[PDB]
């Protein structure tokens, strides 16, 4: 795409980020906006969000701690 | 004379439209270092540039 202006797996990346991200007219603060929101709040948002989703999806954290499987039953199952 | 006159607005005062239109739609980069410019309340350095 850089060489172009110097589902194709996955065309949504350069496509949506191109025609979205080039159609900004005062972009230069908004780049810092998506940066400074997305770093902390997105990284902790996803990394929280999946473990939440399993953490109530079929939890049952039963096999609560190890069920005392000694000791060094280190991820035995 | 059409190479002076039908040679269009160059006579380039649409660069003034680039000066106000790019004084507003490009105020998100120069003032991005200079939101507080002459002070440090919003903590920014007094630098925007005169280019164009």
JSON list of C-alpha atoms in Angstrom, two decimals:
[
{"chain": "A", "resi": 1, "resn": "UNK", "atom": "CA", "xyz": [0.00, 0.00, 0.00]},
{"chain": "A", "resi": 2, "resn": "UNK", "atom": "CA", "xyz": [2.99, 2.26, 0.60]},
{"chain": "A", "resi": 3, "resn": "UNK", "atom": "CA", "xyz": [4.34, 0.95, -2.70]},
{"chain": "A", "resi": 4, "resn": "UNK", "atom": "CA", "xyz": [0.92, 1.63, -4.21]},
{"chain": "A", "resi": 5, "resn": "UNK", "atom": "CA", "xyz": [1.34, 5.32, -3.34]},
{"chain": "A", "resi": 6, "resn": "UNK", "atom": "CA", "xyz": [5.15, 5.62, -3.41]},
{"chain": "A", "resi": 7, "resn": "UNK", "atom": "CA", "xyz": [-10.88, -10.92, 0.95]},
{"chain": "A", "resi": 8, "resn": "UNK", "atom": "CA", "xyz": [-7.14, -10.56, 0.38]},
{"chain": "A", "resi": 9, "resn": "UNK", "atom": "CA", "xyz": [-6.32, -11.77, 3.94]},
{"chain": "A", "resi": 10, "resn": "UNK", "atom": "CA", "xyz": [-6.88, -9.38, 5.50]},
{"chain": "A", "resi": 11, "resn": "UNK", "atom": "CA", "xyz": [-8.13, -6.50, 3.40]},
{"chain": "A", "resi": 12, "resn": "UNK", "atom": "CA", "xyz": [-10.03, -4.90, 6.28]},
{"chain": "A", "resi": 13, "resn": "UNK", "atom": "CA", "xyz": [-6.75, -3.80, 7.89]},
{"chain": "A", "resi": 14, "resn": "UNK", "atom": "CA", "xyz": [-5.33, -1.58, 5.18]},
{"chain": "A", "resi": 15, "resn": "UNK", "atom": "CA", "xyz": [-8.80, -0.97, 3.74]},
{"chain": "A", "resi": 16, "resn": "UNK", "atom": "CA", "xyz": [-10.70, 0.25, 6.78]},
{"chain": "A", "resi": 17, "resn": "UNK", "atom": "CA", "xyz": [-7.64, 1.83, 8.33]},
{"chain": "A", "resi": 18, "resn": "UNK", "atom": "CA", "xyz": [-6.85, 3.52, 5.03]},
{"chain": "A", "resi": 19, "resn": "UNK", "atom": "CA", "xyz": [-10.19, 5.00, 3.93]},
{"chain": "A", "resi": 20, "resn": "UNK", "atom": "CA", "xyz": [-10.98, 5.64, 7.57]},
{"chain": "A", "resi": 21, "resn": "UNK", "atom": "CA", "xyz": [-7.59, 6.95, 8.65]},
{"chain": "A", "resi": 22, "resn": "UNK", "atom": "CA", "xyz": [-6.83, 9.05, 5.56]},
{"chain": "A", "resi": 23, "resn": "UNK", "atom": "CA", "xyz": [-10.25, 10.75, 5.61]},
{"chain": "A", "resi": 24, "resn": "UNK", "atom": "CA", "xyz": [-9.31, 12.74, 8.69]},
{"chain": "A", "resi": 25, "resn": "UNK", "atom": "CA", "xyz": [-8.83, 16.48, 8.16]},
{"chain": "A", "resi": 26, "resn": "UNK", "atom": "CA", "xyz": [-7.29, 17.50, 11.53]},
{"chain": "A", "resi": 27, "resn": "UNK", "atom": "CA", "xyz": [-5.79, 14.10, 12.23]},
{"chain": "A", "resi": 28, "resn": "UNK", "atom": "CA", "xyz": [-2.70, 15.04, 14.21]},
{"chain": "A", "resi": 29, "resn": "UNK", "atom": "CA", "xyz": [-4.30, 15.35, 17.67]},
{"chain": "A", "resi": 30, "resn": "UNK", "atom": "CA", "xyz": [-6.62, 12.42, 17.05]},
{"chain": "A", "resi": 31, "resn": "UNK", "atom": "CA", "xyz": [-3.63, 10.12, 16.45]},
{"chain": "A", "resi": 32, "resn": "UNK", "atom": "CA", "xyz": [-2.48, 10.99, 19.96]},
{"chain": "A", "resi": 33, "resn": "UNK", "atom": "CA", "xyz": [-6.08, 10.44, 21.10]},
{"chain": "A", "resi": 34, "resn": "UNK", "atom": "CA", "xyz": [-6.34, 6.85, 19.87]},
{"chain": "A", "resi": 35, "resn": "UNK", "atom": "CA", "xyz": [-2.79, 6.26, 21.12]},
{"chain": "A", "resi": 36, "resn": "UNK", "atom": "CA", "xyz": [-3.23, 7.54, 24.66]},
{"chain": "A", "resi": 37, "resn": "UNK", "atom": "CA", "xyz": [-6.65, 5.99, 25.14]},
{"chain": "A", "resi": 38, "resn": "UNK", "atom": "CA", "xyz": [-5.91, 2.69, 23.50]},
{"chain": "A", "resi": 39, "resn": "UNK", "atom": "CA", "xyz": [-2.57, 1.77, 25.09]},
{"chain": "A", "resi": 40, "resn": "UNK", "atom": "CA", "xyz": [-3.55, 1.46, 28.73]},
{"chain": "A", "resi": 41, "resn": "UNK", "atom": "CA", "xyz": [-7.30, 1.14, 28.41]},
{"chain": "A", "resi": 42, "resn": "UNK", "atom": "CA", "xyz": [-7.33, -1.15, 25.43]},
{"chain": "A", "resi": 43, "resn": "UNK", "atom": "CA", "xyz": [-4.48, -3.42, 26.54]},
{"chain": "A", "resi": 44, "resn": "UNK", "atom": "CA", "xyz": [-5.99, -3.85, 29.98]},
{"chain": "A", "resi": 45, "resn": "UNK", "atom": "CA", "xyz": [-9.43, -3.90, 28.36]},
{"chain": "A", "resi": 46, "resn": "UNK", "atom": "CA", "xyz": [-8.71, -6.97, 26.23]},
{"chain": "A", "resi": 47, "resn": "UNK", "atom": "CA", "xyz": [-6.36, -8.68, 28.70]},
{"chain": "A", "resi": 48, "resn": "UNK", "atom": "CA", "xyz": [-8.99, -8.17, 31.36]},
{"chain": "A", "resi": 49, "resn": "UNK", "atom": "CA", "xyz": [-11.87, -8.91, 29.01]},
{"chain": "A", "resi": 50, "resn": "UNK", "atom": "CA", "xyz": [-10.98, -12.42, 27.88]},
{"chain": "A", "resi": 51, "resn": "UNK", "atom": "CA", "xyz": [-10.15, -13.66, 31.38]},
{"chain": "A", "resi": 52, "resn": "UNK", "atom": "CA", "xyz": [-13.46, -12.21, 32.52]},
{"chain": "A", "resi": 53, "resn": "UNK", "atom": "CA", "xyz": [-15.25, -14.00, 29.68]},
{"chain": "A", "resi": 54, "resn": "UNK", "atom": "CA", "xyz": [-13.87, -17.38, 30.68]},
{"chain": "A", "resi": 55, "resn": "UNK", "atom": "CA", "xyz": [-13.99, -16.32, 34.36]},
{"chain": "A", "resi": 56, "resn": "UNK", "atom": "CA", "xyz": [-17.77, -16.47, 34.26]},
{"chain": "A", "resi": 57, "resn": "UNK", "atom": "CA", "xyz": [-18.42, -18.31, 30.97]},
{"chain": "A", "resi": 58, "resn": "UNK", "atom": "CA", "xyz": [-17.97, -21.85, 32.17]},
{"chain": "A", "resi": 59, "resn": "UNK", "atom": "CA", "xyz": [-16.50, -21.09, 35.58]},
{"chain": "A", "resi": 60, "resn": "UNK", "atom": "CA", "xyz": [-16.50, -23.28, 37.89]},
{"chain": "A", "resi": 61, "resn": "UNK", "atom": "CA", "xyz": [-13.06, -22.33, 39.10]},
{"chain": "A", "resi": 62, "resn": "UNK", "atom": "CA", "xyz": [-13.80, -25.59, 40.89]},
{"chain": "A", "resi": 63, "resn": "UNK", "atom": "CA", "xyz": [-10.49, -27.30, 40.80]},
{"chain": "A", "resi": 64, "resn": "UNK", "atom": "CA", "xyz": [-10.13, -24.47, 43.25]},
{"chain": "A", "resi": 65, "resn": "UNK", "atom": "CA", "xyz": [-6.64, -24.26, 44.24]},
{"chain": "A", "resi": 66, "resn": "UNK", "atom": "CA", "xyz": [-5.06, -27.37, 42.70]},
{"chain": "A", "resi": 67, "resn": "UNK", "atom": "CA", "xyz": [-7.72, -29.36, 44.48]},
{"chain": "A", "resi": 68, "resn": "UNK", "atom": "CA", "xyz": [-4.53, -29.65, 46.63]},
{"chain": "A", "resi": 69, "resn": "UNK", "atom": "CA", "xyz": [-2.94, -31.83, 43.92]},
{"chain": "A", "resi": 70, "resn": "UNK", "atom": "CA", "xyz": [0.63, -32.05, 45.13]},
{"chain": "A", "resi": 71, "resn": "UNK", "atom": "CA", "xyz": [2.77, -30.32, 44.38]},
{"chain": "A", "resi": 72, "resn": "UNK", "atom": "CA", "xyz": [4.12, -30.20, 41.29]},
{"chain": "A", "resi": 73, "resn": "UNK", "atom": "CA", "xyz": [1.00, -31.61, 39.83]},
{"chain": "A", "resi": 74, "resn": "UNK", "atom": "CA", "xyz": [2.09, -28.74, 37.68]},
{"chain": "A", "resi": 75, "resn": "UNK", "atom": "CA", "xyz": [-0.71, -28.19, 35.20]},
{"chain": "A", "resi": 76, "resn": "UNK", "atom": "CA", "xyz": [-1.25, -31.91, 35.32]},
{"chain": "A", "resi": 77, "resn": "UNK", "atom": "CA", "xyz": [-4.60, -32.12, 33.55]},
{"chain": "B", "resi": 1, "resn": "UNK", "atom": "CA", "xyz": [-2.88, 37.00, -21.73]},
{"chain": "B", "resi": 2, "resn": "UNK", "atom": "CA", "xyz": [-4.90, 33.86, -21.14]},
{"chain": "B", "resi": 3, "resn": "UNK", "atom": "CA", "xyz": [-1.51, 32.47, -20.11]},
{"chain": "B", "resi": 4, "resn": "UNK", "atom": "CA", "xyz": [-1.65, 35.23, -17.51]},
{"chain": "B", "resi": 5, "resn": "UNK", "atom": "CA", "xyz": [-5.41, 35.44, -16.86]},
{"chain": "B", "resi": 6, "resn": "UNK", "atom": "CA", "xyz": [-7.09, 32.22, -17.96]},
{"chain": "B", "resi": 7, "resn": "UNK", "atom": "CA", "xyz": [-4.01, 30.90, -16.36]},
{"chain": "B", "resi": 8, "resn": "UNK", "atom": "CA", "xyz": [-6.10, 30.81, -13.24]},
{"chain": "B", "resi": 9, "resn": "UNK", "atom": "CA", "xyz": [-5.87, 32.08, -9.66]},
{"chain": "B", "resi": 10, "resn": "UNK", "atom": "CA", "xyz": [-2.07, 31.77, -9.46]},
{"chain": "B", "resi": 11, "resn": "UNK", "atom": "CA", "xyz": [-2.68, 34.81, -8.42]},
{"chain": "B", "resi": 12, "resn": "UNK", "atom": "CA", "xyz": [-2.45, 32.18, -5.75]},
{"chain": "B", "resi": 13, "resn": "UNK", "atom": "CA", "xyz": [-4.68, 33.63, -3.01]},
{"chain": "B", "resi": 14, "resn": "UNK", "atom": "CA", "xyz": [-6.20, 30.21, -2.44]},
{"chain": "B", "resi": 15, "resn": "UNK", "atom": "CA", "xyz": [-2.96, 29.76, -0.48]},
{"chain": "B", "resi": 16, "resn": "UNK", "atom": "CA", "xyz": [-4.60, 32.22, 1.92]},
{"chain": "B", "resi": 17, "resn": "UNK", "atom": "CA", "xyz": [-7.46, 29.70, 2.06]},
{"chain": "B", "resi": 18, "resn": "UNK", "atom": "CA", "xyz": [-4.68, 27.23, 2.78]},
{"chain": "B", "resi": 19, "resn": "UNK", "atom": "CA", "xyz": [-3.43, 29.68, 5.42]},
{"chain": "B", "resi": 20, "resn": "UNK", "atom": "CA", "xyz": [-6.71, 29.90, 7.36]},
{"chain": "B", "resi": 21, "resn": "UNK", "atom": "CA", "xyz": [-7.97, 26.44, 6.39]},
{"chain": "B", "resi": 22, "resn": "UNK", "atom": "CA", "xyz": [-4.52, 25.12, 7.24]},
{"chain": "B", "resi": 23, "resn": "UNK", "atom": "CA", "xyz": [-4.45, 27.48, 10.20]},
{"chain": "B", "resi": 24, "resn": "UNK", "atom": "CA", "xyz": [-7.46, 25.53, 11.55]},
{"chain": "B", "resi": 25, "resn": "UNK", "atom": "CA", "xyz": [-7.29, 21.97, 10.17]},
{"chain": "B", "resi": 26, "resn": "UNK", "atom": "CA", "xyz": [-3.54, 21.86, 10.87]},
{"chain": "B", "resi": 27, "resn": "UNK", "atom": "CA", "xyz": [-3.76, 23.45, 14.33]},
{"chain": "B", "resi": 28, "resn": "UNK", "atom": "CA", "xyz": [-3.79, 19.89, 15.72]},
{"chain": "B", "resi": 29, "resn": "UNK", "atom": "CA", "xyz": [-0.03, 19.43, 15.10]},
{"chain": "B", "resi": 30, "resn": "UNK", "atom": "CA", "xyz": [1.70, 22.76, 15.80]},
{"chain": "B", "resi": 31, "resn": "UNK", "atom": "CA", "xyz": [-0.43, 23.52, 18.86]},
{"chain": "B", "resi": 32, "resn": "UNK", "atom": "CA", "xyz": [-0.12, 19.83, 19.84]},
{"chain": "B", "resi": 33, "resn": "UNK", "atom": "CA", "xyz": [3.28, 20.88, 21.15]},
{"chain": "B", "resi": 34, "resn": "UNK", "atom": "CA", "xyz": [1.95, 24.36, 22.01]},
{"chain": "B", "resi": 35, "resn": "UNK", "atom": "CA", "xyz": [-1.46, 24.06, 23.71]},
{"chain": "B", "resi": 36, "resn": "UNK", "atom": "CA", "xyz": [-0.14, 26.04, 26.71]},
{"chain": "B", "resi": 37, "resn": "UNK", "atom": "CA", "xyz": [2.43, 27.68, 24.52]},
{"chain": "B", "resi": 38, "resn": "UNK", "atom": "CA", "xyz": [3.56, 30.79, 26.40]},
{"chain": "B", "resi": 39, "resn": "UNK", "atom": "CA", "xyz": [3.10, 29.02, 29.77]},
{"chain": "B", "resi": 40, "resn": "UNK", "atom": "CA", "xyz": [3.12, 25.52, 31.29]},
{"chain": "B", "resi": 41, "resn": "UNK", "atom": "CA", "xyz": [-0.41, 25.20, 32.70]},
{"chain": "B", "resi": 42, "resn": "UNK", "atom": "CA", "xyz": [-1.45, 22.66, 30.06]},
{"chain": "B", "resi": 43, "resn": "UNK", "atom": "CA", "xyz": [2.32, 21.97, 29.87]},
{"chain": "B", "resi": 44, "resn": "UNK", "atom": "CA", "xyz": [3.32, 22.74, 26.30]},
{"chain": "B", "resi": 45, "resn": "UNK", "atom": "CA", "xyz": [6.29, 24.44, 24.64]},
{"chain": "B", "resi": 46, "resn": "UNK", "atom": "CA", "xyz": [5.88, 27.73, 22.79]},
{"chain": "B", "resi": 47, "resn": "UNK", "atom": "CA", "xyz": [6.60, 26.30, 19.31]},
{"chain": "B", "resi": 48, "resn": "UNK", "atom": "CA", "xyz": [4.33, 26.20, 16.27]},
{"chain": "B", "resi": 49, "resn": "UNK", "atom": "CA", "xyz": [6.36, 27.28, 13.22]},
{"chain": "B", "resi": 50, "resn": "UNK", "atom": "CA", "xyz": [5.88, 29.79, 10.41]},
{"chain": "B", "resi": 51, "resn": "UNK", "atom": "CA", "xyz": [6.05, 27.31, 7.51]},
{"chain": "B", "resi": 52, "resn": "UNK", "atom": "CA", "xyz": [3.56, 28.22, 4.78]}
]
